[PDB]
Amino acid sequence: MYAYNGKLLDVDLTREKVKEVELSEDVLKKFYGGRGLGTYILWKELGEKWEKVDPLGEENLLLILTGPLTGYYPGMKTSIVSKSPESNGVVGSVLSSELGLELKAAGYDGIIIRGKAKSPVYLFIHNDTVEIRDATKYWGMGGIELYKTLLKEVHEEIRKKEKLKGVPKEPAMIYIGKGGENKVRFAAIMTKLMHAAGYGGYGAVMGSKNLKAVIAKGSGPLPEVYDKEKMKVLLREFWKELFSMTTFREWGTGAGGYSVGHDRSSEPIRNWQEEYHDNEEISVVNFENRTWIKKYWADYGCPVNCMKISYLRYGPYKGSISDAPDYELQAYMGTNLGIFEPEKIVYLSYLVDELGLDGINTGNILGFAAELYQRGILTKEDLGFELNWGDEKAFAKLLHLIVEKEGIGKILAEGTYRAALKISEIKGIDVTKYAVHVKGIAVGAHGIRSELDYTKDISYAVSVQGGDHTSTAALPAKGYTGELVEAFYDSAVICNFVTKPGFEKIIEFGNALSGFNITPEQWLNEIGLRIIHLQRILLLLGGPDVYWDPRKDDDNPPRFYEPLPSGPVKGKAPNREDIKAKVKQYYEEIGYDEHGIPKEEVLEELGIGEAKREVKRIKKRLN
Amino acid sequence: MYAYNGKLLDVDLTREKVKEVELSEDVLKKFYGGRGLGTYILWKELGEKWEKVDPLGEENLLLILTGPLTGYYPGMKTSIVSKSPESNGVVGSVLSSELGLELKAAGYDGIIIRGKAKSPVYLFIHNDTVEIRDATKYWGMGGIELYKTLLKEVHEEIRKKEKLKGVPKEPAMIYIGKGGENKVRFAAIMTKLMHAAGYGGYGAVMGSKNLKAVIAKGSGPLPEVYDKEKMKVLLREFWKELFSMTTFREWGTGAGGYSVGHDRSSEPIRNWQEEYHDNEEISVVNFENRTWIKKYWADYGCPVNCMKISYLRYGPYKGSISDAPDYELQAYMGTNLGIFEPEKIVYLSYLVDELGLDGINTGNILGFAAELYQRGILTKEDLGFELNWGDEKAFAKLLHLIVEKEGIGKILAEGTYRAALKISEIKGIDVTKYAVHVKGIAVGAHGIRSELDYTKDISYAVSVQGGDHTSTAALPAKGYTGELVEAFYDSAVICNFVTKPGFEKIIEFGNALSGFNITPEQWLNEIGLRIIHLQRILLLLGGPDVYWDPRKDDDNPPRFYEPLPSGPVKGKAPNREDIKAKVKQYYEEIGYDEHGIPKEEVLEELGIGEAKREVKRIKKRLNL
Amino acid sequence: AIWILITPDKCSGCRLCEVTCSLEHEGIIWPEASRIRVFELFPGINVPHTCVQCPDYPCVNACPTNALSVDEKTGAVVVNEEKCITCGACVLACPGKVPRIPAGKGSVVICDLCGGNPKCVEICHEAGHDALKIVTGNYRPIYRTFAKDPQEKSLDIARKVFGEDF
Amino acid sequence: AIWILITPDKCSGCRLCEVTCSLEHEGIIWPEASRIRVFELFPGINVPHTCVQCPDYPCVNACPTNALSVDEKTGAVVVNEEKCITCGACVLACPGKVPRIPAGKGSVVICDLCGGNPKCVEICHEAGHDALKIVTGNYRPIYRTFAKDPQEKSLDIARKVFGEDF
Ligand SMILES: CCC[C@H](O)S(=O)(=O)O
Ligand SMILES: CCC[C@H](O)S(=O)(=O)O
Ligand code: SF4
Ligand code: SF4
Ligand code: SF4
Ligand code: SF4
Ligand code: SF4
Ligand code: SF4
Ligand code: SF4
Ligand code: SF4
Ligand code: SF4
Ligand code: SF4
Ligand SMILES: [Cl-]
Ligand SMILES: [Cl-]
Ligand SMILES: [Mg+2]
Ligand SMILES: [Mg+2]
Ligand SMILES: [Mg+2]
Ligand SMILES: [Mg+2]
């Protein structure tokens, strides 16, 4: 076919068996790829027993996916989809690994990873060769050492193999750190030190299957495309337009650490107790002059080059390496902990990258703990040390308790939602009022109270990915912002930052690749909608330990109803009954009933009628 | 006055007095600036007693000079001129210090430094304020530490003073390192860590006066110019031409360490025993990938940005900083010592920069010692250790003996020529046959035997700057290569690397600044010629310890007559009879008599008839 | 509207920006009268420094004689040199110490953006350094945080490059 | 005569050069068929790698079936893909390990300088990276020393940036 190989790898780590499975054109026209394709596979294989599947057990599926735009659209993303250890629903995460490109160049569109290896393994894919290999020497390594050993050794192996064909480029590698190895709930899947499949806890899923890394190298062409000269014309168009985004190419998201708090008053400061600051220490000019050793860094075929590398050659944290750091790390590993200095923020960002922990949910649990310490709820005896705002060494000590699940680390390693329930139970006090999460996922570093940011009222409240600021809901529920357009980019799969040409132009590019005739209206009313409904269903079915009730859990954390205590919109916060009105309105526009459960009529019009079986179980454990 | 302020600072370190002296239009039309102006001042003040002037004694003058194009023409050079501890003549040396630019913005065109301070001092110039200041705390500092302390403190002082006028740019600084403080004969004057007034031994002159540094800051405009609109037009055109020199902007002289020996077979290898190599370790690609932390570094107003910064973060020499290194360091602190690895060359280039030693005459003395060791003339017991080719640690230990004048270092610190005579006398063996010098100055790293380089037959032999490869002679003696055009750039003062527009266009640019109407012909036949003749006269008068005889010393070192042992032109070398023929012909065209002494007639036409008094002292000593 | 984005680590120290700006505005070479000045406090660490057009214009509001105003089209500061009494108030009001009074001028100098077509950016681009680039579009408040002391930017960069050995 | 001068520390790893070259020569995106290939053995150390047109053409002179020749106008290697038996002799003769046989192609690929107008340099310049530049004079023998194993260049750069900590 066009744009796809029409093929997935199917890897049973339990039986140590690999096979190829066909991707029908029917499935691809219905679900496209990435997030959509993974949601289908998960519902198809697990939806009947969903509430019994432990995300950290042998029966979960880890899906590594691409989409038709995967090799051809500017920039580079690989999609990762699984049952989430955080929400017990599904998260379409992405990361800028060339893994998806190398898979496509090797003949595949993705990997279904089943079961659980008896000992640490890694998956090695080189053109037609696929092997499950012992990884016990690398279990315990962070990313830097993993590149210097495992990745280097595999590249030399491949170079010896192809001595007479020349020197192949390096293979792509996704991997976990010690956080995923020890099943910390908010562990990430990493690539190239600094890129993450961040939301969802998939580092813990990967770690729970004893999978250290996936390494892939392809040397053939990408699948052919339907209209090659329309592809070339649009590509030149897209490059010219993307080259013009001067400040985003020069600074990336690294201007956010100052600008989100100062300009939009929507940045978490000390576990969201404030959302405004005027602290110029954290301005990008200081990250650049004090830490940036590479100002322009790009993923495959990317004209934006939004990435940067920060590196510390001085001070006690000498050796720390991170990116700009990304704004979400500047906020959650910085201002959310009361820390405004680049040197300390690069240090803490380096630690979560090296440990393979999602910086958002990590900073959220750390700021949560620090607020409990400030309020006397967690004592110096509970922690083992003082946990003051601004003290980067106290926060690094806590990070290492979490990854080793030592002392209080064993509770915190379960994530903010579960920890706040456990501590509430233990202390006889409601500490869930300090947990800033939605559906068990830490709220991304864009608050709703100021209404000066893109996030407001129901953005997180009704979303099938909860606190995930990269896939928020909007009103109108269709229309070019909101879950449906975001589900597209996560199914393409393409990088968000490279969508300047616009949703329609990008669908048009996709049709020129694939030979499909998908329209924006069909995405918004059918393909996108059925992805969102299946994710809503799996999220409402919930996991074995935590279940959501839309009448309770389609809401903002209560801190978001307290008036902002500072800044140029001091006193502002949304009103709880206005949110409920908007939640009700979102339900109708998206096709959920009045309780927020997808309408069975809608499910049949969408072609996923057999999901009514799942809706009935929802309604039972509902009424 | 156009293009000039019309005045020099006159600094007497002995009496600790400072005054301004007037620079007449007539002197400037006669000698232009820089190397020429300095040669005049030296002849006028000292020429009648030249042969009694010790370059290392308090009667020597140290001249820091500009020319009319300094500050306007692209690039930046300051001129340094004195009596040379090496040749006992005069060297128009330059370095890319903004000192000349700041001086001109402060109202002066140069500094005459006389006498000798009782203890270490530095000279501080800030617009109207000129002060001699205690430098005792800074004596002994290399350039890195000097920038971090002295220069920083002085910048903060200027900031505090000009608090209500804003933040001044940094002052410019020239300085000496330990080699200069200890009067090592081939010590350089340094700026910005890795730029040098390299040839001439002027770091020893400055060290002999107890002058650690000169620091200058000006914040006024440069002098008015005669035709500012023409200046502006030519600048744009010059920039556009200079921008196009792609490989020189990307690599500087850094491709020389490989290309001079491999392509031109004219690079010194193991004290010139070979001149060809095939070794790719020294290619610029390996300096760039292993060591360059700044690929484009430029001096003031320079569109060429030929400079680079090399810095080692690894290995035993971690912390070493230098430039590409400059080709002459890659050869003389590298291949000349049998060292081809960039890491080791950056290390040795850093040491020579940090000590304030000219890399050319330093590598020359080091390779000379290593060949004496190889031949058994200098023993392990004479040195205190083995001095094998390729051993960068052996060479570094010897560098430190030299600067401290300890053991064999005390002899070596006098330079290759004087050391070869002392060793010859001590050992009863002629080791001058291994000394590659002309008129007491180490031959620059461009040999003559292959004839594939720009240097050939009489290039060093007849030059008033001896082994100085940056001011060689050529045949025809006038015309657009040779000593006269080099003396122009050393007097203009501008950087050689920025002369792509050509000698004629650069003169025309000079006239648009100054309101003069100098032509190329009068530079070649008068102004340049009188500069060269006074330099020839002063070199023939010679210092107190060493004198030259043109019948003997207008020649190439003996190694340049042995056939090349290797490479594509194995077997090649000039014949000493053809050199003699060319030397006598060079005399005719430049206006020297049969014995290479300037013609009394020519001196009169050139307008320097009084120098006949010096010519007669020369014939008296040479008994005609 | 335009704003000059500076990347100090791409700065070669060629100072052709200073030559171009001071020739353009003064007709003569005059380093300290250039409205962009490059600070090289340690060899090879080059920090170009100029106006950032603070939205609150501290300089303009501190001027006691109203010598300073804001151009309506560009947003640049404009100096009336005849009104300027060289008191240094704008120098002290400026978060980055940008205003400069060169010796003998009789007035401050502050970047006027060349009326909307920076000649410093053009020559830096022509030279291939691109340490200066133009951003077009609405002012972002983070731009204002680039007005900081050139000596702190220089010490920051030197420690980043040379580490504990600086 | 043109030659591509590469500055690895200006390389962002955008690999738009790979996309342009493979689209131009294969009509499809195909990273390992690009005649310029960027090696990123450690994150952030990006080494672009291509033919240097050795004046002694080791590849051309090692080819057993005479599939390789030299273009008279440009100095570039030309591949006759129908004559190529993918034996790897040119791969082994090349000082830089530059010739590449991509999977399923049936022929080596080697840079042909785009007939004298490199499209990789154009896109690299348009993106503002300028890691690739054209030099236009006569061939200099030092160019040949740029043909080096990409792994050696990467390790050199990594050590120069990260020091003893690498
Ligand atoms: C300044 C915008 C930041 C991006 O939205 S993010 O928070 O890095 O996802
Ligand atoms: C490659 C030419 C080098 C220059 O001539 S130099 O020897 O650095 O003076
Ligand atoms: S925009 Fe940034 S993240 Fe997205 S692909 Fe390009 S470089 Fe990678
Ligand atoms: S060419 Fe090199 S040395 Fe001459 S002035 Fe320009 S940068 Fe300095
Ligand atoms: S022109 Fe660009 S590179 Fe040269 S000094 Fe000015 S800013 Fe730095
Ligand atoms: S930077 Fe200084 S000078 Fe420019 S606007 Fe702000 S205050 Fe005025
Ligand atoms: S210096 Fe001139 S411009 Fe600045 S405040 Fe005083 S008067 Fe106004
Ligand atoms: S924009 Fe114009 S005025 Fe402002 S600095 Fe650049 S050149 Fe000078
Ligand atoms: S285009 Fe230039 S910057 Fe991008 S990868 Fe190719 S060489 Fe490196
Ligand atoms: S670089 Fe390799 S491929 Fe190119 S000419 Fe030299 S040998 Fe042939
Ligand atoms: S691989 Fe093809 S081109 Fe290279 S030598 Fe063998 S046949 Fe000739
Ligand atoms: S020059 Fe043409 S062929 Fe050679 S690499 Fe660049 S794009 Fe490919
Ligand atoms: Cl240092
Ligand atoms: Cl490292
Ligand atoms: Mg990151
Ligand atoms: Mg996302
Ligand atoms: Mg130097
Ligand atoms: Mg010279």
PDB file of N, CA, C and O in Angstrom, chain B residues 462-464 483 529 531-537 539-540 550 554 583-603:
ATOM      1  N   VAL B 462      68.913  38.877   1.760  1.00  0.00           N
ATOM      2  CA  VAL B 462      69.181  40.313   1.677  1.00  0.00           C
ATOM      3  C   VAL B 462      68.239  41.161   2.530  1.00  0.00           C
ATOM      4  O   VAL B 462      68.462  42.384   2.649  1.00  0.00           O
ATOM      5  N   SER B 463      67.223  40.550   3.157  1.00  0.00           N
ATOM      6  CA  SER B 463      66.176  41.294   3.865  1.00  0.00           C
ATOM      7  C   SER B 463      66.709  42.063   5.082  1.00  0.00           C
ATOM      8  O   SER B 463      67.517  41.556   5.868  1.00  0.00           O
ATOM      9  N   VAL B 464      66.210  43.284   5.271  1.00  0.00           N
ATOM     10  CA  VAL B 464      66.576  44.042   6.463  1.00  0.00           C
ATOM     11  C   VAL B 464      65.944  43.484   7.735  1.00  0.00           C
ATOM     12  O   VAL B 464      66.237  43.971   8.829  1.00  0.00           O
ATOM     13  N   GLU B 483      60.145  43.674  -0.005  1.00  0.00           N
ATOM     14  CA  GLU B 483      60.288  44.374   1.261  1.00  0.00           C
ATOM     15  C   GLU B 483      59.533  45.692   1.264  1.00  0.00           C
ATOM     16  O   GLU B 483      59.115  46.161   2.326  1.00  0.00           O
ATOM     17  N   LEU B 529      61.439  53.096   0.085  1.00  0.00           N
ATOM     18  CA  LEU B 529      62.884  52.930  -0.111  1.00  0.00           C
ATOM     19  C   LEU B 529      63.676  53.577   1.021  1.00  0.00           C
ATOM     20  O   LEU B 529      64.674  53.011   1.489  1.00  0.00           O
ATOM     21  N   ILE B 531      62.650  53.943   4.115  1.00  0.00           N
ATOM     22  CA  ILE B 531      62.453  53.113   5.300  1.00  0.00           C
ATOM     23  C   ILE B 531      63.411  51.925   5.267  1.00  0.00           C
ATOM     24  O   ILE B 531      64.088  51.618   6.257  1.00  0.00           O
ATOM     25  N   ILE B 532      63.468  51.237   4.128  1.00  0.00           N
ATOM     26  CA  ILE B 532      64.351  50.074   3.958  1.00  0.00           C
ATOM     27  C   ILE B 532      65.815  50.473   4.110  1.00  0.00           C
ATOM     28  O   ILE B 532      66.616  49.722   4.691  1.00  0.00           O
ATOM     29  N   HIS B 533      66.192  51.677   3.624  1.00  0.00           N
ATOM     30  CA  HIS B 533      67.615  52.052   3.667  1.00  0.00           C
ATOM     31  C   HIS B 533      68.040  52.363   5.090  1.00  0.00           C
ATOM     32  O   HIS B 533      69.132  51.969   5.511  1.00  0.00           O
ATOM     33  N   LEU B 534      67.181  53.048   5.856  1.00  0.00           N
ATOM     34  CA  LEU B 534      67.510  53.310   7.253  1.00  0.00           C
ATOM     35  C   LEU B 534      67.548  52.011   8.053  1.00  0.00           C
ATOM     36  O   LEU B 534      68.364  51.857   8.978  1.00  0.00           O
ATOM     37  N   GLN B 535      66.649  51.070   7.740  1.00  0.00           N
ATOM     38  CA  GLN B 535      66.715  49.769   8.399  1.00  0.00           C
ATOM     39  C   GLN B 535      67.987  49.021   8.009  1.00  0.00           C
ATOM     40  O   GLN B 535      68.629  48.401   8.862  1.00  0.00           O
ATOM     41  N   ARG B 536      68.344  49.044   6.726  1.00  0.00           N
ATOM     42  CA  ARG B 536      69.615  48.458   6.313  1.00  0.00           C
ATOM     43  C   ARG B 536      70.793  49.096   7.047  1.00  0.00           C
ATOM     44  O   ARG B 536      71.702  48.390   7.505  1.00  0.00           O
ATOM     45  N   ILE B 537      70.794  50.430   7.183  1.00  0.00           N
ATOM     46  CA  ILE B 537      71.917  51.106   7.826  1.00  0.00           C
ATOM     47  C   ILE B 537      72.030  50.682   9.287  1.00  0.00           C
ATOM     48  O   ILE B 537      73.111  50.294   9.749  1.00  0.00           O
ATOM     49  N   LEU B 539      70.881  48.018  10.820  1.00  0.00           N
ATOM     50  CA  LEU B 539      71.280  46.615  10.911  1.00  0.00           C
ATOM     51  C   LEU B 539      72.784  46.449  10.662  1.00  0.00           C
ATOM     52  O   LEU B 539      73.436  45.608  11.299  1.00  0.00           O
ATOM     53  N   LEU B 540      73.337  47.211   9.706  1.00  0.00           N
ATOM     54  CA  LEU B 540      74.781  47.146   9.446  1.00  0.00           C
ATOM     55  C   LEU B 540      75.585  47.772  10.586  1.00  0.00           C
ATOM     56  O   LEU B 540      76.675  47.285  10.904  1.00  0.00           O
ATOM     57  N   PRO B 550      78.089  42.155   5.364  1.00  0.00           N
ATOM     58  CA  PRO B 550      77.296  41.742   4.187  1.00  0.00           C
ATOM     59  C   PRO B 550      78.006  40.775   3.269  1.00  0.00           C
ATOM     60  O   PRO B 550      77.343  40.030   2.533  1.00  0.00           O
ATOM     61  N   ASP B 554      74.865  38.212   4.149  1.00  0.00           N
ATOM     62  CA  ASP B 554      73.794  38.271   3.157  1.00  0.00           C
ATOM     63  C   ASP B 554      73.729  36.931   2.430  1.00  0.00           C
ATOM     64  O   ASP B 554      73.969  36.815   1.232  1.00  0.00           O
ATOM     65  N   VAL B 583      72.089  38.189  -5.189  1.00  0.00           N
ATOM     66  CA  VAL B 583      72.309  39.161  -4.124  1.00  0.00           C
ATOM     67  C   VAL B 583      72.929  40.434  -4.693  1.00  0.00           C
ATOM     68  O   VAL B 583      72.509  41.550  -4.374  1.00  0.00           O
ATOM     69  N   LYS B 584      73.938  40.282  -5.558  1.00  0.00           N
ATOM     70  CA  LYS B 584      74.553  41.455  -6.165  1.00  0.00           C
ATOM     71  C   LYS B 584      73.544  42.197  -7.024  1.00  0.00           C
ATOM     72  O   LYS B 584      73.502  43.431  -7.026  1.00  0.00           O
ATOM     73  N   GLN B 585      72.700  41.465  -7.735  1.00  0.00           N
ATOM     74  CA  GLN B 585      71.661  42.137  -8.498  1.00  0.00           C
ATOM     75  C   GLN B 585      70.649  42.839  -7.589  1.00  0.00           C
ATOM     76  O   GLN B 585      70.140  43.915  -7.933  1.00  0.00           O
ATOM     77  N   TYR B 586      70.334  42.251  -6.431  1.00  0.00           N
ATOM     78  CA  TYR B 586      69.393  42.910  -5.536  1.00  0.00           C
ATOM     79  C   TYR B 586      69.966  44.234  -5.050  1.00  0.00           C
ATOM     80  O   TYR B 586      69.252  45.238  -4.994  1.00  0.00           O
ATOM     81  N   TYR B 587      71.266  44.251  -4.717  1.00  0.00           N
ATOM     82  CA  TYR B 587      71.974  45.481  -4.367  1.00  0.00           C
ATOM     83  C   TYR B 587      71.764  46.586  -5.412  1.00  0.00           C
ATOM     84  O   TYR B 587      71.495  47.747  -5.065  1.00  0.00           O
ATOM     85  N   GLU B 588      71.923  46.239  -6.701  1.00  0.00           N
ATOM     86  CA  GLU B 588      71.801  47.228  -7.772  1.00  0.00           C
ATOM     87  C   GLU B 588      70.416  47.849  -7.778  1.00  0.00           C
ATOM     88  O   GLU B 588      70.273  49.070  -7.867  1.00  0.00           O
ATOM     89  N   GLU B 589      69.382  47.009  -7.746  1.00  0.00           N
ATOM     90  CA  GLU B 589      68.022  47.501  -7.897  1.00  0.00           C
ATOM     91  C   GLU B 589      67.555  48.283  -6.673  1.00  0.00           C
ATOM     92  O   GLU B 589      66.746  49.201  -6.814  1.00  0.00           O
ATOM     93  N   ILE B 590      68.052  47.953  -5.471  1.00  0.00           N
ATOM     94  CA  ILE B 590      67.569  48.620  -4.257  1.00  0.00           C
ATOM     95  C   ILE B 590      68.383  49.857  -3.886  1.00  0.00           C
ATOM     96  O   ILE B 590      67.952  50.623  -3.006  1.00  0.00           O
ATOM     97  N   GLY B 591      69.546  50.076  -4.510  1.00  0.00           N
ATOM     98  CA  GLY B 591      70.352  51.253  -4.234  1.00  0.00           C
ATOM     99  C   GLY B 591      71.453  51.094  -3.211  1.00  0.00           C
ATOM    100  O   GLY B 591      71.842  52.098  -2.600  1.00  0.00           O
ATOM    101  N   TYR B 592      71.933  49.869  -2.974  1.00  0.00           N
ATOM    102  CA  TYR B 592      73.136  49.591  -2.198  1.00  0.00           C
ATOM    103  C   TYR B 592      74.325  49.564  -3.149  1.00  0.00           C
ATOM    104  O   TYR B 592      74.171  49.299  -4.342  1.00  0.00           O
ATOM    105  N   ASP B 593      75.522  49.772  -2.603  1.00  0.00           N
ATOM    106  CA  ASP B 593      76.724  49.700  -3.433  1.00  0.00           C
ATOM    107  C   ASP B 593      77.123  48.231  -3.636  1.00  0.00           C
ATOM    108  O   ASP B 593      76.374  47.298  -3.317  1.00  0.00           O
ATOM    109  N   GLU B 594      78.320  48.030  -4.188  1.00  0.00           N
ATOM    110  CA  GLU B 594      78.813  46.703  -4.562  1.00  0.00           C
ATOM    111  C   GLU B 594      78.890  45.763  -3.361  1.00  0.00           C
ATOM    112  O   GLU B 594      78.775  44.543  -3.513  1.00  0.00           O
ATOM    113  N   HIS B 595      79.122  46.316  -2.173  1.00  0.00           N
ATOM    114  CA  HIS B 595      79.256  45.560  -0.942  1.00  0.00           C
ATOM    115  C   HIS B 595      77.969  45.544  -0.112  1.00  0.00           C
ATOM    116  O   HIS B 595      78.005  45.113   1.042  1.00  0.00           O
ATOM    117  N   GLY B 596      76.850  45.996  -0.676  1.00  0.00           N
ATOM    118  CA  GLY B 596      75.579  45.996   0.029  1.00  0.00           C
ATOM    119  C   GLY B 596      75.364  47.115   1.026  1.00  0.00           C
ATOM    120  O   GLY B 596      74.477  46.997   1.883  1.00  0.00           O
ATOM    121  N   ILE B 597      76.148  48.185   0.958  1.00  0.00           N
ATOM    122  CA  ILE B 597      75.985  49.354   1.824  1.00  0.00           C
ATOM    123  C   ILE B 597      75.243  50.428   1.034  1.00  0.00           C
ATOM    124  O   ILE B 597      75.616  50.696  -0.116  1.00  0.00           O
ATOM    125  N   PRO B 598      74.196  51.042   1.590  1.00  0.00           N
ATOM    126  CA  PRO B 598      73.441  52.057   0.838  1.00  0.00           C
ATOM    127  C   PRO B 598      74.349  53.109   0.195  1.00  0.00           C
ATOM    128  O   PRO B 598      75.287  53.617   0.820  1.00  0.00           O
ATOM    129  N   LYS B 599      74.054  53.435  -1.062  1.00  0.00           N
ATOM    130  CA  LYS B 599      74.814  54.448  -1.796  1.00  0.00           C
ATOM    131  C   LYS B 599      74.607  55.841  -1.195  1.00  0.00           C
ATOM    132  O   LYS B 599      73.468  56.279  -0.998  1.00  0.00           O
ATOM    133  N   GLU B 600      75.708  56.541  -0.905  1.00  0.00           N
ATOM    134  CA  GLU B 600      75.598  57.928  -0.470  1.00  0.00           C
ATOM    135  C   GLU B 600      74.729  58.759  -1.415  1.00  0.00           C
ATOM    136  O   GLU B 600      73.895  59.547  -0.955  1.00  0.00           O
ATOM    137  N   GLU B 601      74.881  58.583  -2.730  1.00  0.00           N
ATOM    138  CA  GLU B 601      74.013  59.274  -3.687  1.00  0.00           C
ATOM    139  C   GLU B 601      72.546  59.051  -3.345  1.00  0.00           C
ATOM    140  O   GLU B 601      71.778  60.003  -3.182  1.00  0.00           O
ATOM    141  N   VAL B 602      72.145  57.782  -3.244  1.00  0.00           N
ATOM    142  CA  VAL B 602      70.748  57.430  -3.032  1.00  0.00           C
ATOM    143  C   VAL B 602      70.235  58.063  -1.748  1.00  0.00           C
ATOM    144  O   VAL B 602      69.190  58.722  -1.736  1.00  0.00           O
ATOM    145  N   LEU B 603      71.003  57.953  -0.666  1.00  0.00           N
ATOM    146  CA  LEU B 603      70.622  58.618   0.575  1.00  0.00           C
ATOM    147  C   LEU B 603      70.319  60.107   0.381  1.00  0.00           C
ATOM    148  O   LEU B 603      69.362  60.631   0.974  1.00  0.00           O
TER     149      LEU B 603
END
